[PDB]
Each structure stands twice: as structure tokens, then as C-alpha cells.
Design a protein around this nucleic acid. Structure first.
Lengths: 322, 322, 322, 322
DNA sequence: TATAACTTCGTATAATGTATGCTATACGAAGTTAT
DNA sequence: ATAACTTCGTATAGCATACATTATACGAAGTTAT
DNA sequence: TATAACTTCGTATAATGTATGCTATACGAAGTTAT
DNA sequence: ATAACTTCGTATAGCATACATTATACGAAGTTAT
């Protein structure tokens, strides 16, 4: 069909309208689905519902997460819907089976994990140790953890901070201007303020890195063996390395990860977000203020991190013994 | 017509998409609709809005509640939508009778109900009346009333408990790990501390019952007319029974049921939930604390349980009393 | 057209799906539009945009409120849309002229008025006088004002209160169950609690009226010359009479209305709502609690009663002199 | 084609549907689009999405802001929608470039701006520098800066003020009745108290100006090079002039403009609004109090003015400082 | 040189929220009028 | 010529109204147990 | 009877918010099993 | 026969997930100034 080619061509022409990660996962899903189709001699593009049902069942049978299976469907759905074709999910075979796969897995324990929390106590411990070190690695890392926990920004937001994004209060606290986040793309964007402590941590790093040469440098950059910063205004510190700082800081305190292969045996990119969310809840911060903290315009995900603070809470118990 | 045959096979094949309670209600509604149709010379499938409209008006004439009339309409919508067919509710005729029937029925003052509060006033009365009775079922029921008040846990939830789900903490207080979640984006297991007095009751029951003798054994079990427990791990105590414990306990104090045929004359499955929440807000406890105690996230409902408390009477009452 | 007749016939068949006031104003607008069409020899049913534009301009030219003109359009729009025909507002002639008429009127002062406030001070004054009277008129009226100001219910909500809708707290305060309001039609509905003062006022009235004979009596009923109540379970006190109580209570204190013909020279049905809203704001009640008070699920109308509390507010002024 | 001729006549005829500022921007955009089309051999009307897409990409290449690119697109959407024609934005091509252009531009860090804060630090500086200067324009400007700080009133709003809109209260404080509303569901006239020091300045100005000599005379008026005021009541001082007072006042202290061509180097119309709000939140004032001071109901905006204040730094900063 | 400390990348899995269309201001710059 | 505007055009920040009902507001006429 | 105190009604004008579709419990009642 | 269930059906209250992305998680391979 002429129209389908056109629609696809249009989406590719302005591919920059979508996150690069959407593209990353579009192609990845397409590769997996392409492969399954080839293994079973099946037309892979206009995808047949029943074929899609077999494929979701096969993903299930490989032991894949409910959420990852929803991903494979999601991209297939997007590829079809933006083509002008009907979505696989538009048929019952796919709809019902997706709902069924979720029900079976969930009803056998499957649960979406969350990042191991990096909370205030963790931050103070990390800091009590590393604040002394005059190494470049250590000063940078300590400053990044500070920002992460102070501001609750995602790591991709942190790696985009430019030195000119930083301003100041009369009070002396650093403010970091963010524009783009996951949930938001604006020109006015948001301001996130650091405490006086974290501001110092960040001053130390600026000072010692020489990022402030060009004010269009990324606040965070790489640091080599010899301890020399490598500022850039065109290459940011990969988010993979910020994941690494979290894994190294965890390793520093708790030693090496298990042999098991499980996710979340050590801190990761999101660890400071669930942790600072959680600390606020427990100090009585109001639910709106928590949402303002993490950029959350809606209430449900925040309830869904105090999710697992829901431990022994024991209101009724006290009531009972008196 | 061939399409809808496919769509109905899609449904039987992926029947595990829905819980067996949904299928139950689906089947029940179809039975009611098909009867009505036969008795009124109407084709039952596909349904035509004129016939669906008369049917909903028959359901109103019959005294059925509005939530009930919605359910019949819902499953009819469901059944037709899961085939290639138009839903009744997408017709102007059925859409207007639902509106007409809703408001009509509220004007004659049909009232949504809820569980009769089983409170602390009531758990002392009961304890008082059978604290030190040595009957093996009097011991079981007393324990279970404990767990239901303390943990505001649903009834199917208490059915599932086992002895392997019971650790300890300060004083003795038992650690009931749970499946309070049957959802993906939701806690990976929750936890409930019993009081010391209630931990004591779920001790004395474990003695007599002898449920410990297997980990995989369910906590609550059947107890026959000879006061002997009958542990199992393939067979959990039904919800209807746990219901029964509550009604029996009501009969104990207040005697035989009021005989209107009405609902919520005795206590039922939820009475302890309702009661505990009310007790909890009476002594002042953060509403979102209450919300976490029985795993609510949709305050519409908990609100309805504590409405007639004096602590909830609102701002105007507060102002007026100067 | 056959379809248009059918659609209209369907709406009339289940007319009870719409408020009777919608019907009242449908016919009233139709009468006015019918009349204008007859005066200008114009087809009145499928209404021509340009004819509708002339008619809105004529309503403007009679000096009618912007909001009343929006009403005439509203019903014309509804009559057409529910017929299956295009709305007048679907054309530019009508759209643009409506927007223009609003702009001209507003840009010459026109503003939507609000009810004269009946606030706490007013209620205490009214009460300081009438609380003594043992007349039936006075006891009833005083109790209605109490409820109005205490609960913020609209008068139609107040006239629907049945004696069985009333319950109690442990604390001794009356609760009044509402089901239907303007913005809401439910079976669970809402509970509104009276203070201890208003509860007394209401006790006096119940006591002295004999409404509590049949518990399906309307809490408020008429009272004749001789001071004898006339309870009914099938005829409520007209909302026009509740408007009258407000006008009489105003007259009692401030004397007779002007000669001017202006609306809101004396208290009316909504006077206690804007007044209690306003009092809450000024005592620092939180904006959510205000919304809970008046049944308001959204924030804008409440801002739009503290609307005209916005008087001399003078935060900046204090700042300036120090 | 005849339809769109009707639709364009509908528009000229009801041209008062929109403000003359909307028409201005509409006309401006058409001029830009038509030029671009001629210069690029494209039909200007109806617009085809391919051509609109290239045009928006030309607007991005030209350095225009995203709010600006939206405006061009908006008026194009408007113009076409008010004819029987499809909007550009309803095409997949233009929809994706707008997305692409938005995020693209935020990544090179284009930043939404706002008025440079004219604060109390700045109104003392100014007063200091010209408190007791006897120049008739130095007297006018000083007064007006007063009114703008004190009342956070927009500039067109201050233009409209007259002497007949000025009563009194405690000490002298002037009573500026206003048209802060140009909306129906909105206050029926508002009110602003000036301070005593500022009331003094709007006294000394009325002396010299001689504006009192007619009620209907506008408060602020033109003052020629011979230090003589020129009252009018048919002619209000333009907004561009009131702007000018602010820039002049900036030049006074800081000298000639920074010469980047940039925006918000001096103060402008809104500077006093911005400044006053910031000052108001600095000394702690309920946010919704601030919101009422300049008639906001959409806190998105006021938030943006007080972001870098230390009192607004958020919960995390508060927790971290123990 | 070997090596820290990356980047790049693939597949795997969590998170996150359900909008614009009109109207005001900003400002350089050209037009107007009386000093 | 120039101060001190006003008018303008193009660039951006700042805001409010439409839609589909459902309700109250009030003067005026008909009703009914005193 | 005249009259308070309505009801009914018409036209006029303000107010008010942008949802369900699945899954659990309630309970009388019939079925089952061991005392 | 009966207590004490379980299973059932029909009646209602109580709840949670789908959708379209955009992001992080982490092991493993290629890179590069020391």
C-alpha cells in the first residue's frame, strides 16, 4: 500500500519527534518479532493477531517479565497504528491473551521490582567517608549522589545539566534549571534547589574539574586514571556511568553483588528517587510536596514507592494495647 | 457471523483473561436476559437496544439496585463488544433509560449499603463472652476475629494465610506476610503485625487446631461437630464460612436475624475492616495512614466508612462551635 | 426525516433522564424562538444559523444577560444535537456572534451577579432574635436557615430531605443524608453534619411540627396561619417558599426592597452558600475542605465566590510601611 | 469554495469576536506565511501540510522561539478552521514537526523568559534618587512606579485608571476601583489600597499634573519637554509609554542597555508584578494570598516568579538541613 | 605498554500521564506633535 | 532638531472560555384551610 | 368570610463539571460429609 | 438427623488496569589517554 509506505516515511523523516529510546526499543522489538516470524515462516509486517498471540505466549514461555511483554506489544501497536493499519491489540486474540498472561504471571508471584533505595542515611554514610578524599573521582561522584538525592532528577536529566543551567539564591544555595524530563518538555521548565551541604559538594567538584571554563560545558564529565577531568560541551557523561557510580558506591560499602543475576542487588539510577520520596513520606511531608519534589504531576507512582515502605506500619496495634 | 464465532472462541480459549467471578456474573446475567427474552419473544443475541431497554426497565420494576442494573448492562456491553457487535450502551435508547433509571431510583431513595461496623466495643463484648471458654471452635472464631480487626484484611485474603507465613517481632507480635496484592505495579509482598493480646489468641488456636504440623497448612481450617480441627493445605476455609463466623458471632449477642430479608443486619466479611478504620479515625490517625492499613488507594471508600464520626463532621461544624 | 422524528420521540419517551428544569427551559426557549420566527416569517425547526444569529442579536438588543443568551443557544444546540442534526453553534455565524455578544456586553460592564451573602454574623443575628419565638413559622424558618448555612445544600436538596434521611452521631449531632444534588446522582451520596446548635434548632422544629409521624415525611413542610404544620410524604415544601424564607428574614432585619427591580437586594436560595464559603476562606479553612463542604469536586466556582470577598485585602500595603 | 467565502464574510462581519490584538497577530502571521510562500512558490491558501511543515522548519532555522512557532501554527489552524478547511495540525506531517521542533529546541536550551524583578530594593533606590526632585515627570514616574508595585496591576489596567476611580480609607490610602476583570464569571469590580507613602506620591502628582479638574480624566497622562502635564479623558497614556517609564528608570541607575538585542535587560511592564510577588513571598505570605494580589488563578505563573527564593526551595532542602 | 575508566549497545524491564486557543506584553522602529 | 510621545509590526509570555446541562431568581397568578 | 401562607409557572439568569469495566463480597439455599 | 461445612446463584459493593510512549538496568564489547 502507498499510504502505509508514506506514513512510515513521514515518521522516519521527523524521527526526532520521538525519544531515541522509543526508536531503540521499536527496532529491538522488531528484531525479536522478525526473528520469531522467520523461525515459524510468518509474514512479519502487517502482523496477524494470532501470530502476535503465539509470540506473546512465547515471550511468556521464555520467562520474560509481564512488563517486557507489554513492551513488545506496545511497539507492535505503535508500528501498526502509525502506519495507518489496525493494532494487534484491536483484536481479541491479542487483547485477551495479554490480559491473561498478566493474570497468570502475577498470580504466580511476578511483581514489578523497584530500585533499591538510596536514602538519607545512605547518603550521610557515603558522605562521611568520601567527603575527605581529594581525588577527582570521589569529589564528582559525591556531588552527583548529592544532586541525585537532593533533586530526585533521573540520570538522563543529570547528565544534561550544563554549567549555565546553574544559578544561585540570595541565600547562597545552588539552583539547577531543568527543561526536558521524561514526563515534560518545556522552555520554562523547572528549577531544583540544592541545600547548603550539597551546594558545597558541587562547588568542590566545579572547582576541581574546571567545567566552568566554557559555561556550556556539561556540569558532569568523565575523569581518567590520573584524576584529570575531561570537560565537554558536546559530549555528556553517559547515564551508564552514572549507573556505575551508584553501583561502585554500593560496592564500596557492602562489597560485591551476589552470583544470582537478580536486578537491584545494588543501587542504580533510580535509587535516590525512591529513597528521597520514601524519606519525605516518613518525615510527614505532604503528598503534594512530594509530587512537586520528583516532578510528579499525578499521585499514583508516589504511592507506588511508599509502596514498599509499607512494611510494619502498625497503627492498629498501638490502638489495641490500651 | 463467522467473525463472532471466532470472537467467542477467542473468549473460551483465553478464558483465563478474567477471574471465575467475572465469568460467573457474565453467565448469570445471560441466563437472566435469555429467560426474559424467551418469556417475552425477543431474540437474545445479538441484542437490540429496544429489547435491552425494556429489560432494564423490567430490572427496575423488579426492585433491583442501580449497581445491579449497571452490572447486567455491563456484561451485555462486554459480551457484545468482545464480539464484532455494537454495544447496547452505544445506543441512544439504552443510554437514556440508564440515566432515567439511575435518577428515578435515587429519588425514591434507594441507598447504597456497607458492612455493619465490627468495632472495639464489639470485640471486647465478644472476648468478654468467650475469652476463657475452652471450646475448640469458640477458640478459632475468637482468633480469626482478632486477625480481621487487626489487619483489616479481606476474607479471601485470610483464607490464604498459612503457618509458614508467620514470623515474630517484639513481645511475640506475629508477622503475617501476605498476598494483599494481586496486581503488578504494587507491593512485592506486604506485612501485618498483630497485637500482643491477639497474637495470644492466634497462639491458643494453633495449639488446639494443630496446624503447625505442616508449613504449607492454611492457618484457619474446618472444625467439625466433635470440636476437632481438620488441618489441610490443599483446602482453605471458604469465604462463606468466614462470613459465617461473623454472623454467628452476631447471633450470639443479638440473637436471630431481623427477618426483613434485608442486608447488613448481622456483621459480614468486611465488618472488621469498616470497624477498624472507624476506630482508627476516632482516636485520630492520619487518613492516608488508615488508607495504608487496609491497602486502600481511592479514598472515596474509606470516607464512606467513617462519615458519621464526630471527628469527620467538617469545617462548618468546627467554625459554628466557635 | 424519519430519523429526526425517532430521536426526538426517544428523548421524550425517557424524558425523566433529564432534569425537569432542562425540560422547563427547553420549552421556554422554544417558545421565545418560535415567537421570533413567527414575527419574521422563519422556519423555526431545523434552525438556520443566520436566523439564530439574528435572534441572539435580538436577545442582546432587549438588554438580556450574556448568560441568558447563552441559555437560548444552549437549548437550541441541545434540541438539534439530540435530533441528530448539526448544532447552530457548529456554524461560524452563531459561534462568532455569541463570542462577540459576550465581548461587547462584558466590555460595557455586564457581569454575572451572585447571591447576597448570608454569613455567620447574619445567622447569629437572625438567631438572636427568632430563637425565642415559639411560633411554628419561626422555628421552621430558623431551622432551615441553620441547615442552609451549616450544610451549604441548595434549596432543592433541602426540600427533598426526608425524616428518614436523618441519623445521628455518638456525639449527638444530626447527620443528613443527601443522594441527589445538582452535580451528582448517586445511591451512596453524601452525609452532612449539623453542629450542636443547629441540631437543637432542628430538634425544636421536628418536635413542634410532628413531621416524625411517618419517617417518610419531608423534614420541611408548610405551616398555615394558625401555626399548624402540614406534614406530607408526597409533597415537599416548594423551593420558592425557601426563597421566600430568605426574603422574609432579610426584610425582617433590613426592611423592604428598593423600587429598582434589581436582583439580589435581599437574601435568596444561594445566599448561605456564598456566605459559608466566604466565611471558611476568611477563617483560613483549606481550599479542599471548602470544596468538601459545598459538594464542589472542582476548584473554580469556590475561587468564584471568594471572588467578591476580594475587597480590600492589602497584603502589599503592610509590607510597604515597615 | 463558495462555503469559505461565506465563512470569511462571517469573520469580517463578526470581527469583534476577537480582540484587535488577536487580529494583529493573525494578520502578521499571514503576512509572514504568504511572503514565505511567494518566495518559495507555494500556494498560500488553502495551506497544504507539506508546505506548512517546511515553513515551521524555516521558522526554527530563523531562531524563533517555540511559543512563537506555536503562534504561527495556531493562527494557521484558526484561519483554516474558521473556513470549511482542514487544519495543518490535523495532519500527521505538521503534528510530528511541531513535536520535533519543540524538543529539539529545548535540547539546545532555549529558555522561556519573564520580567526582570522590580523589587523593594529597587523602589528605595529610585525613591532615594528622586524622592525630592521637583521635575514634573520625575514626580509622575515615581507615582506610577508606586501604583505598579503596590497593585501588581497590568499596564493597560493602569492606563485606564481615572480620578473618579479614587476614594479613601484609614490615613489616606487611596481606593482604586478597577476593571481588573474583562470576564463574565469574575469579580464585579475589584479594589486596591495604596500604602500611605505611595498614596503621598499619587498626591504630589495629582497636584502638579492637575488631573482632578475633570472626573472622567485618566490619572496618568502625557508630560511634554517643558515639564507641563497634558490631561485628557479621550486619550489615555499608551502602554508603550508606561513600559518606557520602566526602562528609563532602569537606565537612570544602570545606564544604557546591554546591547545583545536580548530581552529583559531593563525592567518592563510586568517587572513590578514579578517584583512585588517575590517580595511578598520573601516575608512569608499565603501563596493564594499572593494569587489574589495580582488576580491570578492558575499558579503555574506566580510559581515561576518566586522560584529562586530560598523560602521556595522545597522539602528536600528543608529535610537535608536537619 | 597494561589498565581505569569509559562509551556504545543490546536485550530486559520500570515509569508515567491522560490539552489549547485567544489575548496580553516586549520592544525596536517609524510617525507625530509641540517645544 | 528633539523630547516625549503614539502607532506599528513582529516576537513572545500570559491567560480564560466553550460546552451541556441543571440549578436558582423572582413577580404574578391561582388555591386553600383557616 | 378576608387572609396568610402557599403552589404553580413563566421568563430571566447563575452554576458546574469534564468515566468504567472488571472483580470481590453478601447471602439464602441446596449439596456434602462425618459425627 | 444435624453441625459445620462447600458450592452455587443471584445481588451488590469495591476496586485497578489499559494505553503510548519514554525512561532506566545491566552485561558485554569496543576505545583511549594515560
Amino acid at each position: 500500500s502507498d499510504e502505509v509506505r508514506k506514513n512510515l516515511m513521514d515518521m522516519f523523516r521527523d524521527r526526532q519527534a520521538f525519544s531515541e529510546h522509543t526508536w531503540k526499543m521499536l527496532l529491538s522489538v522488531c528484531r525479536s518479532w522478525a526473528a520469531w516470524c522467520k523461525l515459524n515462516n510468518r509474514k512479519w509486517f502487517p502482523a496477524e493477531p494470532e501470530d502476535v498471540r503465539d509470540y506473546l505466549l512465547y515471550l511468556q514461555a521464555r520467562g520474560l517479565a509481564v512488563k517486557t511483554i507489554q513492551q513488545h506489544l506496545g511497539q507492535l501497536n505503535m508500528l501498526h497504528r502509525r502506519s495507518g493499519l489496525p493494532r494487534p491489540s484491536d483484536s481479541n486474540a491479542v487483547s485477551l491473551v495479554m490480559r491473561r498472561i498478566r493474570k497468570e504471571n502475577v498470580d504466580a508471584g511476578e511483581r514489578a521490582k523497584q530500585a533499591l533505595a538510596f536514602e538519607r542515611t545512605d547518603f550521610d554514610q557515603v558522605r562521611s567517608l568520601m567527603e575527605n578524599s581529594d581525588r577527582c573521582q570521589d569529589i564528582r561522584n559525591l556531588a552527583f549522589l548529592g544532586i541525585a538525592y537532593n533533586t530526585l532528577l533521573r540520570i538522563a536529566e543529570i547528565a544534561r545539566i550544563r554549567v549555565k543551567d546553574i544559578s544561585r539564591t540570595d541565600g547562597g544555595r545552588m539552583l539547577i534549571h531543568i527543561g526536558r524530563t521524561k514526563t515534560l518538555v518545556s522552555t520554562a521548565g523547572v528549577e531544583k534547589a540544592l541545600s547548603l551541604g550539597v551546594t558545597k559538594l558541587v562547588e568542590r567538584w566545579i572547582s576541581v574539574s574546571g567545567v566552568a571554563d566554557d559555561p556550556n560545558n556539561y556540569l558532569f564529565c568523565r575523569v581518567r586514571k590520573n584524576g584529570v577531568a575531561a570537560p565537554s560541551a558536546t559530549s555528556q557523561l553517559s547515564t551508564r556511568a552514572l549507573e556505575g557510580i551508584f553501583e561502585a558506591t554500593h560496592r564500596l560499602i557492602y562489597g560485591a553483588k551476589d552470583d544470582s543475576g537478580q536486578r537491584y542487588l545494588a543501587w542504580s539510577g533510580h535509587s535516590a528517587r525512591v529513597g528521597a520520596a520514601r524519606d519525605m513520606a516518613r518525615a510527614g511531608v505532604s503528598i503534594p510536596e512530594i509530587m512537586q519534589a520528583g516532578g510528579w504531576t499525578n499521585v499514583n507512582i508516589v504511592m507506588n514507592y511508599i509502596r514498599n515502605l509499607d512494611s510494619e506500619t502498625g497503627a492498629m496495634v498501638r490502638l489495641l494495647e490500651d
